[PDB]
Design a protein around this ligand. Structure first.
Ligand SMILES: Nc1ncnc2c1ncn2[C@@H]1O[C@H](COP(=O)(O)OP(=O)(O)O)[C@@H](O)[C@H]1O
Ligand SMILES: Nc1ncnc2c1ncn2[C@@H]1O[C@H](COP(=O)(O)OP(=O)(O)O)[C@@H](O)[C@H]1O
Ligand SMILES: Cc1cn([C@H]2C[C@H](O)[C@@H](COP(=O)(O)O)O2)c(=O)[nH]c1=O
Ligand SMILES: Cc1cn([C@H]2C[C@H](O)[C@@H](COP(=O)(O)O)O2)c(=O)[nH]c1=O
Ligand SMILES: [Mg+2]
Ligand SMILES: [Mg+2]
Ligand SMILES: [Mg+2]
Lengths: 202, 202
């Protein structure tokens, strides 16, 4: 009985890390086997450079840094498939969508070129998109103009009806948003998993 | 007056590094400005890991290592475009084709998925393919079966008539193959450059 692959997405400040941490805690307290993962995962060899990049300690050519973010997801694919096969539901703080939304926010980056590297990644069973006004996120790639461009790509990605997108009202309290996400998650773990793990964008 | 982008391709042992080195030397002695580059370029941050991988000092998930080879080309794109704009012809020992031929040689790697990361790279003005029997290369990804699979992909790539592919009989002596390549190169530098630098596979 496989685990569910559940991803949280949204702009900076939307609540993804807080709600990812709290989701894994609730699911585990309710007797599920569930573990947290995040992208980029700065602890691997590839991840160290993404961190540095993001921390503006290094300049990496724009297509090069896009590909390093994707390669960082692929290096975790064997772990990802192994844990899911063992019944472990994985809660993932950012995935390919952020990947495309942040690079696709840049000039001369077609969404098509940006999606290719991640074509074939484990397909999430549920994509939670933590929605909130930009000005509310800000009060909590990190500048106003860049966040608004990324949000636009996110909206272009959510037209892909092959994915199980759920909107979450991220402007509520931590606890209210958490209960919304918990209930959606329990449902995906119970029914969305009857089908074999899919492939992203293919 | 831009420089030409000239790439050499072929299986292991075909002569590419020897003929790349000798081409840059001849062109320079004939008053051209020309410089050598090679892929992977193991000296950058990304390149160190590819080297290690190839030297079997590290195991990198198959899609991850494919993307690192591509990212290694993209990080050199600003240098590449700058030198060409300054009139410097670049001789390149392996490029995107080897990239696709060696990953595309693996199981479950469509040529389509393998080409995407490199879509948009500077397009070579001339691709020299150093042709020779596998058994001759061998006497000089490195095993018989892997080389023959890569050669098959190379043949699938050469059907792309948008590229200026030239076959070179790599079974002749070093000097004979060199003169063949020199003459083809002088012609590309003199006429193939009247057009702006293109974009690979787009
Ligand atoms: N619902 C919420 N209401 C108010 N503040 C919140 C809420 N969710 C998270 N925060 C705060 O906002 C900041 C960003 O939260 P975080 O979960 O790190 O967001 P993200 O990972 O999406 O950037 C943190 O200080 C966090 O405590
Ligand atoms: N035309 C040739 N005939 C015989 N040996 C050759 C010829 N070209 C190169 N070699 C030898 O074959 C080996 C591989 O050459 P190299 O240029 O490194 O090939 P590649 O870079 O394609 O792997 C070297 O020892 C080289 O001296
Ligand atoms: C996962 C991912 C994140 N990003 C970005 C979004 C954030 O600005 C940044 C750090 O993410 P984080 O705040 O979730 O750690 O990296 C990319 O640009 N590409 C990617 O593939
Ligand atoms: C350029 C490139 C080479 N390769 C391979 C071909 C060789 O087996 C290896 C070393 O190349 P080399 O002998 O030209 O240094 O790397 C890839 O697998 N992908 C790539 O993008
Ligand atoms: Mg976060
Ligand atoms: Mg060589
Ligand atoms: Mg396509």
């Amino acid at each position: 009985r496989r685990g569910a692959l559940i991803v949280l997405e949204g702009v900076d400040g939307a609540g993804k890390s807080t709600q990812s941490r709290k989701l894994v805690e609730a699911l585990c307290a309710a007797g599920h086997r569930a573990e947290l993962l995040r992208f980029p995962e700065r602890s691997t060899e590839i991840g160290k450079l993404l961190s540095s990049y993001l921390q503006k300690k290094s300049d990496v050519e724009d297509h090069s840094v896009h590909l390093l973010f994707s390669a960082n997801r692929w290096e975790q694919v064997p772990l990802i498939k192994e844990k899911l096969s063992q019944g472990v539901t994985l809660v993932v703080d950012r995935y390919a969508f952020s990947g495309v939304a942040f690079t696709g926010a840049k000039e001369n980056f077609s969404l098509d070129w940006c999606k290719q590297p991640d074509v074939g990644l484990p397909k999430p069973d549920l994509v939670l998109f933590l929605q909130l006004q930009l000005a509310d996120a800000a009060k909590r790639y990190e500048n106003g103009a860049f966040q608004e461009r990324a949000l636009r790509c996110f909206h272009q990605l959510m037209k892909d009806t092959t994915l199980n997108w759920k909107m979450v009202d991220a402007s509520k309290s931590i606890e209210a948003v958490h209960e919304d996400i918990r209930v959606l998650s329990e449902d995906a773990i119970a029914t969305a998993t009857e089908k074999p793990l899919g492939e992203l964008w293919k």
